[PDB]
Amino acid sequence: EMVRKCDPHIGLLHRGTEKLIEYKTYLQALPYFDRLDYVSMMCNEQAYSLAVEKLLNIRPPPRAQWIRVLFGEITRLLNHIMAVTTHALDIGAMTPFFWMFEEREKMFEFYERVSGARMHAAYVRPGGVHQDLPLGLMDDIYEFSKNFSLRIDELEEMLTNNRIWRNRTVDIGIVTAEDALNYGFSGVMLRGSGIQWDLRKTQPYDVYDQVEFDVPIGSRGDCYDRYLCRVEEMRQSIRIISQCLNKMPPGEIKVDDAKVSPPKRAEMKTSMESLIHHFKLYTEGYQVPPGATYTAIEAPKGEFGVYLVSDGSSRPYRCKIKAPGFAHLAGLDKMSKGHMLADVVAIIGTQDIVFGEVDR
Amino acid sequence: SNLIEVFVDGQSVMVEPGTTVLQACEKVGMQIPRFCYHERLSVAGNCRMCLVEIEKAPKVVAACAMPVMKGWNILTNSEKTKKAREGVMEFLLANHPLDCPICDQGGECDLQDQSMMFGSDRSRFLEGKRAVEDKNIGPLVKTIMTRCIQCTRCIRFASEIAGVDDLGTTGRGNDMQVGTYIEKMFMSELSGNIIDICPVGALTSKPYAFTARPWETRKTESIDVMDAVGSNIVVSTRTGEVMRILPRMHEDINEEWISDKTR
Amino acid sequence: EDNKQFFGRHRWVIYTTEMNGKNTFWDVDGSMVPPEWHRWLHCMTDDP
Amino acid sequence: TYKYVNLREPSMDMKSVTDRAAQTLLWTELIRGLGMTLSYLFREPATINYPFEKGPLSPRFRGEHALRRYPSGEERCIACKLCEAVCPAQAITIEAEPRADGSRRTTRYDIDMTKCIYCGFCQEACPVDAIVEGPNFEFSTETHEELLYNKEKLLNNGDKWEAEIAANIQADYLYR
Amino acid sequence: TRDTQLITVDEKLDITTITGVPEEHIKTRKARIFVPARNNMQSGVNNTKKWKMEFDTRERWENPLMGWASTADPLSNLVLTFSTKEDAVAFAEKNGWSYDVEERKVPKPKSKSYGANFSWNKRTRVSTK
Amino acid sequence: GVRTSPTGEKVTHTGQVYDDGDYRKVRFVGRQKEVNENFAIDLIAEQPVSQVGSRVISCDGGGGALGHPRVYINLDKETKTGTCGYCGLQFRQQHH
Amino acid sequence: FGVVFRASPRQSDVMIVAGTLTNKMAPALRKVYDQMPEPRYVVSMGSCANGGGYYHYSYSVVRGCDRIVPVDIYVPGCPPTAEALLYGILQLQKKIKREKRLRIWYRR
Amino acid sequence: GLLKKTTGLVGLAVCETPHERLKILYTKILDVLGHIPKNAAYRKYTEQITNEKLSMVKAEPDVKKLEERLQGGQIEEVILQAENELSLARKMIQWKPWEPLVEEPPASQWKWPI
Amino acid sequence: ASATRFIQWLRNWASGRDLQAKLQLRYQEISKRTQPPPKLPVGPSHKLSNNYYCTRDGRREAMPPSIVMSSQEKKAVSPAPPIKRWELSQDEPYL
Amino acid sequence: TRPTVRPRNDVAHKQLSAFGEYVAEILPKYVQQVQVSCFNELEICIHPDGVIPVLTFLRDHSNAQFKSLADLTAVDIPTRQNRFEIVYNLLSLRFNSRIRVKTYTDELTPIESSVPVYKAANWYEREIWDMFGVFFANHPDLRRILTDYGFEGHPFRKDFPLSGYVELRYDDEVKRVVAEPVELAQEFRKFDLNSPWEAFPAYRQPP
Amino acid sequence: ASTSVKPIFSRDMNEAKRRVRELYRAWYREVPNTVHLFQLDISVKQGRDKVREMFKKNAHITDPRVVDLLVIKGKMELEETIKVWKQRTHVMRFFHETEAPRPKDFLSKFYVGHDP
Numbered sequence A: 001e002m003v004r005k006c007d008p009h010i011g012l013l014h015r016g017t018e019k020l021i022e023y024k025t026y027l028q029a030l031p032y033f034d035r036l037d038y039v040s041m042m043c044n045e046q047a048y049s050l051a052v053e054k055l056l057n058i059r060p061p062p063r064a065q066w067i068r069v070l071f072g073e074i075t076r077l078l079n080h081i082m083a084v085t086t087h088a089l090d091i092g093a094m095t096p097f098f099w100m101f102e103e104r105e106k107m108f109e110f111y112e113r114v115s116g117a118r119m120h121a122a123y124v125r126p127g128g129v130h131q132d133l134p135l136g137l138m139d140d141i142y143e144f145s146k147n148f149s150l151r152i153d154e155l156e157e158m159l160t161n162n163r164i165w166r167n168r169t170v171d172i173g174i175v176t177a178e179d180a181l182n183y184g185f186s187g188v189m190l191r192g193s194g195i196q197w198d199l200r201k202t203q204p205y206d207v208y209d210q211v212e213f214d215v216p217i218g219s220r221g222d223c224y225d226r227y228l229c230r231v232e233e234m235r236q237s238i239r240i241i242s243q244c245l246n247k248m249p250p251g252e253i254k255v256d257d258a259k260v261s262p263p264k265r266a267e268m269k270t271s272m273e274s275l276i277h278h279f280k281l282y283t284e285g286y287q288v289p290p291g292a293t294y295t296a297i298e299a300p301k302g303e304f305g306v307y308l309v310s311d312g313s314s315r316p317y318r319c320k321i322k323a324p325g326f327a328h329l330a331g332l333d334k335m336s337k338g339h340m341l342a343d344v345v346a347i348i349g350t351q352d353i354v355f356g357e358v359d360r
Numbered sequence B: 001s002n003l004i005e006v007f008v009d010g011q012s013v014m015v016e017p018g019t020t021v022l023q024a025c026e027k028v029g030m031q032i033p034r035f036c037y038h039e040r041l042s043v044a045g046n047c048r049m050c051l052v053e054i055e056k057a058p059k060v061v062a063a064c065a066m067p068v069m070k071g072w073n074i075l076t077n078s079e080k081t082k083k084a085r086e087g088v089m090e091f092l093l094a095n096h097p098l099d100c101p102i103c104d105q106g107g108e109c110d111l112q113d114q115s116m117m118f119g120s121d122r123s124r125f126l127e128g129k130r131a132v133e134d135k136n137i138g139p140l141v142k143t144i145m146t147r148c149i150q151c152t153r154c155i156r157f158a159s160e161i162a163g164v165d166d167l168g169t170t171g172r173g174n175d176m177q178v179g180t181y182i183e184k185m186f187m188s189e190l191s192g193n194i195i196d197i198c199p200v201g202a203l204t205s206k207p208y209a210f211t212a213r214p215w216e217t218r219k220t221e222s223i224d225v226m227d228a229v230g231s232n233i234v235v236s237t238r239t240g241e242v243m244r245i246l247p248r249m250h251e252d253i254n255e256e257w258i259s260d261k262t263r
Numbered sequence C: 001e002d003n004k005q006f007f008g009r010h011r012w013v014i015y016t017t018e019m020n021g022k023n024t025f026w027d028v029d030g031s032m033v034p035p036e037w038h039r040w041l042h043c044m045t046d047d048p
Numbered sequence D: 001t002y003k004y005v006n007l008r009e010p011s012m013d014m015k016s017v018t019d020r021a022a023q024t025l026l027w028t029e030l031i032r033g034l035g036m037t038l039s040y041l042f043r044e045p046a047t048i049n050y051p052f053e054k055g056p057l058s059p060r061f062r063g064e065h066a067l068r069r070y071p072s073g074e075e076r077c078i079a080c081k082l083c084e085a086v087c088p089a090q091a092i093t094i095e096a097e098p099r100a101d102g103s104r105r106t107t108r109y110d111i112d113m114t115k116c117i118y119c120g121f122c123q124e125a126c127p128v129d130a131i132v133e134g135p136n137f138e139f140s141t142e143t144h145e146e147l148l149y150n151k152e153k154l155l156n157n158g159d160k161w162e163a164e165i166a167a168n169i170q171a172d173y174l175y176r
Numbered sequence E: 001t002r003d004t005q006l007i008t009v010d011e012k013l014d015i016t017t018i019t020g021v022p023e024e025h026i027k028t029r030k031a032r033i034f035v036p037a038r039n040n041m042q043s044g045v046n047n048t049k050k051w052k053m054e055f056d057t058r059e060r061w062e063n064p065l066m067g068w069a070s071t072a073d074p075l076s077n078l079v080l081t082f083s084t085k086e087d088a089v090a091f092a093e094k095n096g097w098s099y100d101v102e103e104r105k106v107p108k109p110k111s112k113s114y115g116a117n118f119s120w121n122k123r124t125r126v127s128t129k
Numbered sequence F: 001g002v003r004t005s006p007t008g009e010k011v012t013h014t015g016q017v018y019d020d021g022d023y024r025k026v027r028f029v030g031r032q033k034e035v036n037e038n039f040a041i042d043l044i045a046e047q048p049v050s051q052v053g054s055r056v057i058s059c060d061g062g063g064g065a066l067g068h069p070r071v072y073i074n075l076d077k078e079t080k081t082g083t084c085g086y087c088g089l090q091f092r093q094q095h096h
Numbered sequence G: 001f002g003v004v005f006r007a008s009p010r011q012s013d014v015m016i017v018a019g020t021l022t023n024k025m026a027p028a029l030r031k032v033y034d035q036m037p038e039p040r041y042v043v044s045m046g047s048c049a050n051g052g053g054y055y056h057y058s059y060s061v062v063r064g065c066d067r068i069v070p071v072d073i074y075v076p077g078c079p080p081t082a083e084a085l086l087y088g089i090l091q092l093q094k095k096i097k098r099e100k101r102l103r104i105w106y107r108r
Numbered sequence H: 001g002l003l004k005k006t007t008g009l010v011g012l013a014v015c016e017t018p019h020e021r022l023k024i025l026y027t028k029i030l031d032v033l034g035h036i037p038k039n040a041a042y043r044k045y046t047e048q049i050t051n052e053k054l055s056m057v058k059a060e061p062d063v064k065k066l067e068e069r070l071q072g073g074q075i076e077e078v079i080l081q082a083e084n085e086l087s088l089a090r091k092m093i094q095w096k097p098w099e100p101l102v103e104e105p106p107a108s109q110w111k112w113p114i
Numbered sequence I: 001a002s003a004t005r006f007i008q009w010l011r012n013w014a015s016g017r018d019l020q021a022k023l024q025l026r027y028q029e030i031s032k033r034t035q036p037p038p039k040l041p042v043g044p045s046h047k048l049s050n051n052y053y054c055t056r057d058g059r060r061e062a063m064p065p066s067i068v069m070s071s072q073e074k075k076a077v078s079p080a081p082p083i084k085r086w087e088l089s090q091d092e093p094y095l
Numbered sequence J: 001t002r003p004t005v006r007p008r009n010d011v012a013h014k015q016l017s018a019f020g021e022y023v024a025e026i027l028p029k030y031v032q033q034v035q036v037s038c039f040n041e042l043e044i045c046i047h048p049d050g051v052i053p054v055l056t057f058l059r060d061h062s063n064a065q066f067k068s069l070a071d072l073t074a075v076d077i078p079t080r081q082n083r084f085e086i087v088y089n090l091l092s093l094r095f096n097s098r099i100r101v102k103t104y105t106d107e108l109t110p111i112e113s114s115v116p117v118y119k120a121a122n123w124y125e126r127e128i129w130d131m132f133g134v135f136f137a138n139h140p141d142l143r144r145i146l147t148d149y150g151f152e153g154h155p156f157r158k159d160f161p162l163s164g165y166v167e168l169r170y171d172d173e174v175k176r177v178v179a180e181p182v183e184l185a186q187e188f189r190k191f192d193l194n195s196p197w198e199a200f201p202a203y204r205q206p207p
Numbered sequence K: 001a002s003t004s005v006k007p008i009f010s011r012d013m014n015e016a017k018r019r020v021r022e023l024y025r026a027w028y029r030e031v032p033n034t035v036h037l038f039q040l041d042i043s044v045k046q047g048r049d050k051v052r053e054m055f056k057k058n059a060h061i062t063d064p065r066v067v068d069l070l071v072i073k074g075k076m077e078l079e080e081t082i083k084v085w086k087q088r089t090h091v092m093r094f095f096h097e098t099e100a101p102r103p104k105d106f107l108s109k110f111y112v113g114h115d116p
């Protein structure tokens, strides 16, 4: 019954994204980030946008930043529903998947109403967001958020105290704090083992230092504590979304610098300067001053970062993507030691692995 | 020992007498923006895009025409220089037409590119624009004179390089127009070169019209065989087809010109 | 339409039994909805 | 600020120990899970009756491409190639020349719909609202070749869907 | 200096066998090392600063279905950038590519005089401004 | 408009048509050649010339921001109309 | 519709290719196809499977799964909406409805 | 000064005698640092911080107040860091990083953009 | 919403909650699919004076890295001050 | 401050500069250059012999404590004699700070594996070997991780073509997937996008 | 000097050659298992001749570091085969069975296209 060695063979979804990005302008490369961790689309966009904005030495306007936090946390709910329910579905508990994917279906509507796409929105961009929220959207997000914690409670009623669920998760895949750090874990893989770390708290970006939330911390570093952390993080996202809805400011939604963000279509059709800048931004693109940055965010699956190198032109020179699931899967052999074959399925689930980001 | 010492943003450069401020900046690798100036044409000094601040001088000078003086410190990036460029670019674009999508120069336009690098990002011009009649000067050079920025490069080329005095300016002020006054074809064996020197889409290749955008072409540096001069050329191709022929600078052969047959 | 139904079931179409010479009694297809009604049926607008 | 998700020490008195023994032996927490699935059995399902009912969309929805006209019937596309330059997938191929009347118009406008990522960048870049992504999403085919759209196909899509496309543009152009 | 014990290797650096390139695209290719000519349509000189390496153009043909430009040349788009001509040559040699070098063409300094436009007795007098 | 070649194949508004010996027309056997029958060149020609009372007129294609970039058209020549480079509408100065 | 969610490849009648097919993965996809009992159908879902999509020009990507297996329905989109995929499945149903296996057998 | 039940970090056991453990480790570190040349910056800096940490240990008997002074997290985390520093110092003696730069890089090695 | 009171009672009792107050299906509380047109505000750079681009050009204020040391007594320092210890949540310290 | 301009943080800039000097004073044997970017990121450029000593000091030293290896990657710069730049991005939870350590190598010079210092480095170094062809000495299990088995070349090198050299299809005659030289129905279209006018004077290089 | 470099495994060609012969022996003995295990339709003779052909094409190397990398790569290739990480398609890719023979003489290339 016992697993002695676990050798993951990946690359089955390696699509040479990093080499493709070197042939795209910075705007053209943005949609590649939707297709990495393709469960956390807008969080991937935010990371890339922050990195480019840093090299550009510009900052997006306040309303865009609140929109980016609002949809970042909606995206965390999207990811955690997937993480928890597919974790449950793969060990036989199929029903929560169906209940919660109806909730995912309604958050896909928020994606589609702001961007016109259900998943690969391409909505968060360097300089802000592509378009402002349509009238009536915040009311619908409020109505969704009002009932969501009940949906979480129903999920917990199925799993949290279930002895079968606890038997499958408790003391499975224990990770010590010191090992979690040296193996390069992040996100819940760290907090499950008691490490008090969360980039939104410690290295905040956008307006995360203006919202109140608590970081759930585990005590045993096993699959069950990581499951509890993810479920509790969903509650905190609802708590954050509640503040974003109330504190959403007025104003423009992309930086008012037409050498980076395209002008409004009405301006493009009346002003000579606007038309030139529209023409150049959609052909050459904006040039980015030479330099290199490592920019990271607390993505739903852990620390997601890009090492972005600019040579001074309108196309990136190098873009290395740091996917949290890459280091996590690299630790599968370590975590599966002394466990049974059925436990490897539970351990892969608790790592929350999407091969889009692992293989790029 | 005739060289004098001048400074470009504080860096010393030794230049021979008669060197202009613009040429002094070239020596340290700084390219002053320009429209009217062309190094193979007579100095004109009319576009004012090359205006630059001299340290301690209250007035900006036209870098393309001003001889540099011993001890001058040329500030190519001071707020005074940058505000002069923004002001001039604003005047150039006030009456310019919103033609970039339909204009062949788009993508390789010095007005577009210098507007991006040295101009403002928005307009505060709230009036109607000038519109100009088009002039027919033959089957090689199309004219869209509403795009003309009155840099007079074509006039100086036709007079000095081609030895033809058919191009001039008529009228005065904002209605000043480049053209031939009468209905006349600028048929010279070097006529096609006024397409290259014209910084905007006012003069464009009629055979080339609408067929390609500059970014999508591949450049093959080659040689002309239409005569025995051996003019250096760039052959523009796209998706396996020849699109146009352009000059390639060779100081000892064709400089930066080609004949109309070559072109 | 039936506004008492929950969002998504409050509007529906019963397809014609014959369209462009094709017998569609059993063989129906979402592509049969013309563009003017397509906007209403997909709730891109409120008014038919 | 942080909270502990699992750091409660169970009480060890009779009342509590016997409550946990009852749960172990009488399966009470398992019965509770049965109650939740039974409650769902008596809820109305969320299933819509496709294709008679359709999932809701918005005017911004990015679907099948189409080339548009002016009210006079003249094509909007003036072959600027901004769409082809911006296309992240290089899905657009354009050729152009002067038309018989001298107008600047395309002679080729192809979209490989199997390269396209349906990002909508082309319709953002277009200076004259010529290329758009319409609302149609029901255009799957039986062959690969049918998804390689040439200009005729795209103009036909514009004429086919313009009634809906124009209304959707009218509803969202003030956000653009 | 170092605690790492070095070895002496007098061989010319050649990495053809360990690059994975097919034999066809090492020996039959000709690399061109040049500084790009200024695009004559513009006065900006910023694209004439670096050295480039490109490869000989090969056949492109029309796709029977769509008329697209097809190619069988894997190196048709490869363009490398170099700081100096010597760096470009070094890269080409160790990769086993035959090459040609074209010397950089700097514009020669010109004598510009606005006053010459108004000469009393020379042909440089302009007839118009 | 849509004319036909001697082989019977329709000619597109771009002038395309496979000639007699081109095998590639086999792709249309048992299927059809998609052709758009609203030739924009004919449609724009049906539009009447606008008579205006000024030397310069502007066109944005109609519908404001839903049209094209606003351009100004000179009407000094009396031997031709002024045509909009974007939408092809024609203007003519009345009297002068 | 009678379309069971999770069915083993041994009892499956249709393979849906939902995502990018890389070179490293192509042999395993062909193996599953070869092991499907007949009648078997392939639905190609999304731009990547249809023709390479965003990654068409990659060194590691198969430019359309129809280089590996014969495809019956192509569903466009990146991704196709859930409803678009359902439309495609219903299209396959009508394609099966049009089959004439026994009529052709009778006229052999 | 009660004995906390857990450190909260999985795999990090509670220490019964933190003050005595810290004194032994810091004293060992200073002993190891005596084998490094007096002008090596690693010795100067490491002795500075170790003596400051050691002085706090000798002056603060309450564990809870000691942790606040050290600012290194749990006392078991501080102990773990002392062990890491002791391990580092022994390796430093073999590496001798205080010696001059082994080799200068090529002329334009760190030039960006190229 | 259309369930009889008996079925409402049955599923509320089985789930142990008042499900009717938070139905997971949407009815008339959702916003209209037709909305009045917006009028979006303009940013701070929409001004007719005192608006020179050189006073607000973020990209041109970027500078190359400061070289603090190049190959071609003092108090020890850390890259930054040690992180302050987190406080327990007062909203709900223990789950 | 200017609404569209990113604000500078001068305190962090000074702190990172002082710590950069601190590192350079302690490991003069290896540190070649220390710089801090205008957006406050510290880079330590070292001789490749210093990988293990420098990384070990940064992980274990009391005033550093960079316990987490955030990322390890390479950059290919063909114009350099040592074309490959190896970049280590480290994180310190104790001091809530990041640091970047960079070194270099050519196609034939091994780099020492950092797996002894960070077990996270195991797969990162396999990826660098796979994508760039940089060999890591004493790596426990160095082999390809992302490319197909038997794949030839290192595709993240700047001179490896975007579409590669070979492509796959199923061949019915041999009843298997086969590899053949790449032909494209539509060639990838190279665009020349760079403006011929300088964008950033602050980065101008001597003639 | 610039010729004083860091070795990979071998300090000179004679040390490098030993590793080459050890790799060749390992491949030589693996072929019979590979033909059986992957159920190939080639003979053991064909497999071993293919191994010899692969070693010969690199016979002209005189740089020990280059030879080291060739052996390192050759051993990775062997491990993929022995562990059955490769599938039969990967093993048969050395034989180019579906590629038609491209012409090699001047005239034959002249008739078909433009390439040298």
Ligand SMILES: CCCCCCCCCCCCCCCCCC(=O)OC[C@H](COP(=O)(O)OCCN)OC(=O)CCCCCCCCCCCCCCCCC
Binding pocket: A163, D024, D025, D026, D027, D030, D031
């Ligand atoms: C007067 C004195 C007379 C003398 C007689 C007195 C006897 C009365 C007192 C004894 C009571 C006996 C109760 C009988 C049930 C058996 C109890 C049992 O074994 O359950 C415990 C078992 C293990 O529980 P666990 O927590 O995982 O681990 C404990 C061991 N370390 O865990 C389980 O078994 C849980 C069940 C596992 C299967 C879960 C899936 C099914 C759950 C739904 C079932 C619904 C109820 C079914 C009823 C059907 C009736 C027809």
Ligand SMILES: CCCCCCCCCCCCCCCCCC(=O)OC[C@H](COP(=O)(O)OCCN)OC(=O)CCCCCCCCCCCCCCCCC
Binding pocket: D019, D023, D026, D027, D028, D029, D031, D032, D033, D034, D035, D036, D038, I014, I016
């Ligand atoms: C297909 C569906 C068919 C159904 C059609 C509709 C009719 C529905 C009838 C089904 C009735 C069951 C459904 C309701 C169950 C949910 C109720 C519930 O949740 O109770 C939970 C309760 C509290 O549990 P807990 O929170 O853990 O508290 C522990 C300490 N107090 O936990 C408890 O108190 C549990 C108490 C009961 C424990 C009994 C242990 C099992 C004994 C087996 C006897 C079986 C006898 C019945 C068999 C059928 C014969 C009639």
Ligand code: SF4
Binding pocket: A276, B096, B097, B098, B099, B100, B101, B103, B104, B105, B106, B107, B109, B110, B111, B112, B147, B199, B200, B201, B202
């Ligand atoms: S000349 Fe330049 S700025 Fe003027 S319309 Fe043409 S491309 Fe645009």
Ligand code: SF4
Binding pocket: B147, B148, B149, B150, B151, B152, B153, B154, B155, B178, B197, B198, B199, B200, B202, B203
């Ligand atoms: S036509 Fe061109 S070259 Fe002549 S004056 Fe006008 S802008 Fe200058």
Ligand code: SF4
Binding pocket: D083, D086, D087, D088, D089, D090, D091, D092, D111, D115, D116, D117, D118, D119, D120, D121, D122, D123, D133
């Ligand atoms: S939607 Fe995106 S990928 Fe598709 S054609 Fe338009 S720009 Fe290209």
Ligand code: SF4
Binding pocket: B101, D076, D077, D078, D079, D080, D081, D082, D083, D084, D094, D122, D125, D126, D127, D128, D129, D130, D131
């Ligand atoms: S569709 Fe629009 S962007 Fe594309 S070429 Fe035509 S006018 Fe230009």
Ligand code: SF4
Binding pocket: A035, A038, G018, G019, G020, G045, G046, G047, G048, G049, G053, G054, G077, G078, G079, G080
């Ligand atoms: S969503 Fe788009 S990128 Fe992702 S697998 Fe589908 S077609 Fe490919």
Ligand code: FES
Binding pocket: B033, B034, B035, B036, B037, B044, B045, B046, B047, B048, B049, B050, B051, B062, B063, B064, B065
């Ligand atoms: S370039 Fe000097 S005034 Fe025109």
Ligand SMILES: [K+]
Binding pocket: B105, B194, B195, B196, B197, B198, B199, B200, B201, B202, B203, B204
């Ligand atoms: K011109």
Ligand SMILES: [Zn+2]
Binding pocket: F059, F060, F061, F068, F084, F085, F086, F087, F088, F089
């Ligand atoms: Zn018009």
